[PDB]
From Swiss-Prot, chain D:
Belongs to the eukaryotic RecA-like protein family. This is DNA repair and recombination protein RadA. GO terms for biological process: DNA recombination; DNA repair. ATP binds at residues 104-111. It comes from Pyrococcus furiosus (strain ATCC 43587 / DSM 3638 / JCM 8422 / Vc1).
Amino acid sequence: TFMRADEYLKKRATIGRISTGSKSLDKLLGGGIETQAITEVFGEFGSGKTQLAHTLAVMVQLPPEEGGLNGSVIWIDTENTFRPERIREIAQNRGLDPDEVLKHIYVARAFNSNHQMLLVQQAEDKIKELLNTDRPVKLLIVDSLTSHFRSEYIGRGALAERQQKLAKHLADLHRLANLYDIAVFVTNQVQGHILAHSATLRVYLRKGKGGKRIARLIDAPHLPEGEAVFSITEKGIED
Amino acid sequence: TFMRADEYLKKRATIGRISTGSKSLDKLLGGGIETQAITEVFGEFGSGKTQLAHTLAVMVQLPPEEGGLNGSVIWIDTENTFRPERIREIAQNRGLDPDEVLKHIYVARAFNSNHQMLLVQQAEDKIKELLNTDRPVKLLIVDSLTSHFRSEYIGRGALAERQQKLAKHLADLHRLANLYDIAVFVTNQVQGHILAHSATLRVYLRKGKGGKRIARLIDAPHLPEGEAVFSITEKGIED
Amino acid sequence: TFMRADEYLKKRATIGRISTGSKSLDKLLGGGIETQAITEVFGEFGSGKTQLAHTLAVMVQLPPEEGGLNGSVIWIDTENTFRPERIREIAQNRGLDPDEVLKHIYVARAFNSNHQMLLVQQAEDKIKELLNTDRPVKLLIVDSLTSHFRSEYIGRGALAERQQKLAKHLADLHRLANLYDIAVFVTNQVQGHILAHSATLRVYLRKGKGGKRIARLIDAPHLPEGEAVFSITEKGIED
Amino acid sequence: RSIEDLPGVGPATAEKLREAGYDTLEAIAVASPIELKEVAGISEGTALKIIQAARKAANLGTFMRADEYLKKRATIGRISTGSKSLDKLLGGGIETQAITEVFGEFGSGKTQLAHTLAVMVQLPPEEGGLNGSVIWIDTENTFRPERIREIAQNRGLDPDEVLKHIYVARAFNSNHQMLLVQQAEDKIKELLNTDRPVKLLIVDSLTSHFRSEYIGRGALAERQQKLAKHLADLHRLANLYDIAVFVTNQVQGHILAHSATLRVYLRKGKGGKRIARLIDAPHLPEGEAVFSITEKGIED
Amino acid sequence: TFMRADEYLKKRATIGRISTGSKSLDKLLGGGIETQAITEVFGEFGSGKTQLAHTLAVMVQLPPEEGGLNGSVIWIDTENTFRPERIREIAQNRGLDPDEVLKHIYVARAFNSNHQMLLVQQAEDKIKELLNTDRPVKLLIVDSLTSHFRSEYIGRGALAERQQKLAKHLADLHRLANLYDIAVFVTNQVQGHILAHSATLRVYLRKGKGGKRIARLIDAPHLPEGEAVFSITEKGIED
Amino acid sequence: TFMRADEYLKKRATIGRISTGSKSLDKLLGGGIETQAITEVFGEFGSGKTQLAHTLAVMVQLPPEEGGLNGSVIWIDTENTFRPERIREIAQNRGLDPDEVLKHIYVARAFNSNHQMLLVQQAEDKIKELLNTDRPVKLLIVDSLTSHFRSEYIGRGALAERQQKLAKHLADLHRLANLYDIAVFVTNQVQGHILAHSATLRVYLRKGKGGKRIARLIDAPHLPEGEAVFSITEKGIED
């Protein structure tokens, strides 16, 4: 049903923040990507958004002081790009036991749109289970979020239904995000260019100067403006 | 459902690799085509992707140290291009008893899209048999994968429906690939339009100089950036 | 289901070949039209593809050594162009009892697409009898194959189910061709530009210099690259 | 030969050539006899002699030895925008011998930036200027010498003096606009070899008239040609006299200065502040710059 | 006129070659970019074709065994991208006297199409002068060659006028190239579709792997068919 | 003006024939390419039409009894594809002094359409000399004939004067062909679909099975109906 504004001030009071792993990008994200929100990162292939995903899957695991939220991770992989080996590197390269971090990340390969949507639907059960333990789910990744949709739905007279589903999908994520104080991170490859409008926050990133990346926000409401540069290394993302 | 990352590390560790029979190819591919993955090879007619298929139908049969995986083969033929005789000219041609190789390959002629798609619904029962044996299924070929789809879906506003089916087909293959550590090899003639949007790895090959086809990849993650030349001879693909 | 590559090598080994009646063309076909295959002949009206059909209905009846396969014939006529008179003529005029030939040919008039598809369904029943006799069915003709489809399905948004229908029909023929080592011959008048895509071999023929019709293949895989001239006379087709 | 000191050209001829856009040695250098014959009246044969004279005389039709070119660049001045932030983004400020295009939505403050620059350029090098004069081509009737007075008397500058080193011309349409460029060279050489030569040439707006007079897919072609030339006319002045050319372009038809040495995009930001960003990577940083509009024009 | 093949056989022998400063590229180019020819390099912004230009402006100055032809350079700059400073640097970091190098490169800024076309015709004057010198012009650069043309010609029926002019220009360069054994290097930013349909050789290059660039030839006649990788550093381009 | 049908019968009686170098093809051409005619060969890039051109430039030089006509050659090159090297090779490697051949071939590089048309204008001057010598011009090549036209004329409303231009050019060649009993050979790459309509004979050729290019005629009036296979080797073209 509904909820009293005071108790809402309460809910939002508990909004946690995961660090991206680079001082710079955090300043821009005003601390990191937040829970109870869908953060969409989009850019060309190789703009490093899947690295950012991997880094986040580590950070969220460390203590609040360290910039995490002592939480687990649910990862829906649609492009077969999730590399547990990579988590190990970033993790053993950040004061975290490599093989333990992997015990707090749960993946699922999504083979098409219906699968994907059906997977986020199932994540709930997993979320619910770990909700009571010391390390609940705090990060839910969908990478890629748009991949399948922009391939199974071609030509108008399809585009309409795509949105009617992509919107049911995004709504499914928003729910989980708020219902369980989870931060939902989604990627979107960009060169028909569909997007995650509901995105509580959309961050655009591109390949920058010398093997570095650079990201910028999209709009003006809530959060600064300008650009942030960082790089891909062990530890994942670093200033 | 979901898998804990550590398990996933285990899973991905048991990934086998079939040799193409080529020095550059296998190296370019990083040891060749892997299991638990769909490898798509595409190019103009005569670019030799059906030869590559035949070669792979042999290699996979020989021991690991020789570039194989001691496994059987399930072959879905849609263009009536499977030549068991051609297997021999390679088997009993690069060392091996031809009468035995052709005892570990099982074909089915697919006469149209629906037929093709149903051959996977049943390509399982056969993999479920050789499963607990000395030579389980390790290679599943679909040649051609797109042929029928791009011919039965032309109608005003069919493109959409094509995908919703080509995508349910690919998903069916993905499942088998992972559920049974099988390497899935699919061909796609190119040059309206279509390609296995999903897949795990897409390799493009074209005809070259003195009858030598030269391939190349379409990405960079987990795979290098260069070209590979080879030739068609007895033994199938040489180098 | 599937078939062991070896046994498929056995099954394929028994591929018979019907002679077109004319030496030249039969060279281009490397012996002629094969069984376990769909051969499509297409050309303008009067390019003589219905004659070729009639000749074939005779040849197939004579012994292998002469360019036949001692078999019966199933004829699906859609344009009311089957003339036993013509058979009778060719029969005797070749060196065979015309009264005998007219005993191993079974026709059905197809009045529209559904009828047509429905008959190829029932031809299985006739392929069953002859199968145990001395003269099993070895030739199945569909003339015209496309006539009705390109008249009942006018305009995209129909063009769609035309292929669903066409592709299903062709699949029904492919099955029979392989399931019973039958050679399937189909005609297609050309000049909405339809065509049997799953055809095992497509031969194009046009009217030539004077009373002589020329032929040419459509591809490269299997059989030579050149044109073949022949004529229409008693005996049907001859160099 | 510098100007129309060309063989067959007398003042009457020069008159017809100018009123037609053939105002430079390169303009004539690239023309055809037929065109000049029909523009000036001269015969096809003398016009030809004229063309050759120009091809051979052309200033911007000669190559410069890279050692020479390296030095020319060594003498490039820089005007401050009046904002540490923005200047960082420009690597010091807008440069001379270049066309800097600033574009954005109406009200994104690009006309303010123009006014500020018209002051800055007047103060000493250490102050952020080049002790120079200003030529201002106004097409939208947006030049307020009053804003100049202000911004000046707010940086401890004698407004009555600053107002003495800015020269404006109202351009009523494309042809007028383009025409005033050549007449700008007149004043530029006039104030040239003076305590305060011309160091800043503003064209605000640069595109306004072009996107209003050329509507159509048949008008698009020559729209570009004329802009192309106009821009070329500015480039010439920019290099020929170490002048910094600043042009504005309202955006969001569509047009722009494709040959602009540097394009800066700016939009309305936060609250009363504007944010400018560069459109490329070669030469200069790659981030955003925030600033505001106040007395002194642009600040921060 | 119609030079006699004998003489033609000769002239074609008197062709010099500039080294790109990268043994890898040079192999693909077979020595390097040749004189009496227009070599067009095209790729996305930042694919380093302007660097390649700068390097060539150095190489051509050093001795034949060094990989040059002891010649001067004419540079038509249309995008204000010629940095003598960027050149000066290349020579020193390559053992050459930076202040000497810059005495054999002559530039001209082209402000629009007409200007550009002008400059080339006027480049002849210079080429002539330097013709009888210990260091004649051997390299003529046009960067960018297409920039202005694709901006000034976008209206109605403009596309045709763009090719007539583009072609008169290219022909003006071809003449100089042959009339004076000069190598003509032109750049073309890609991604209308404007190109040098007349360039003797077209090389495509893109940004690759880790801060590098991969070169390929768009063709198949003369020279290899493999890609070439290199990098941008002091010395400009490296093998 | 005109010519008495008899004298035209005399003029036509002296129609010479150049051999393509390969027996087979020469059969399809009923002796080869004739004089007083424009023979157009067209096909995809690499279909070997430029080789055929080179071979012809040799054959025409040898005596009639061997498949030539003791004549010189005028070559208009538009794609910079004329290789005296290749001539030299074929020359000697056939049984003739390569140094002599390279004395009866005269080339001109055409840099654009106007240039091209302009040269065919001037070739009359060269056809004049050789006319009185022992080796008059008997072969005039235009390779490529269409290259420049399909690049300078882009879009209908240009397509118009393209033909005005093309048709006028072709007319200029037709005149020379008849006015001087010269055989005019032209190439046309195919795959805006232009083509020499007034061509006396159009031969289409494509790449074949392996290292062998196949040919076929385009019509029926004069010469047979069939395909011809041949290969590229030293001697140029051969069966």
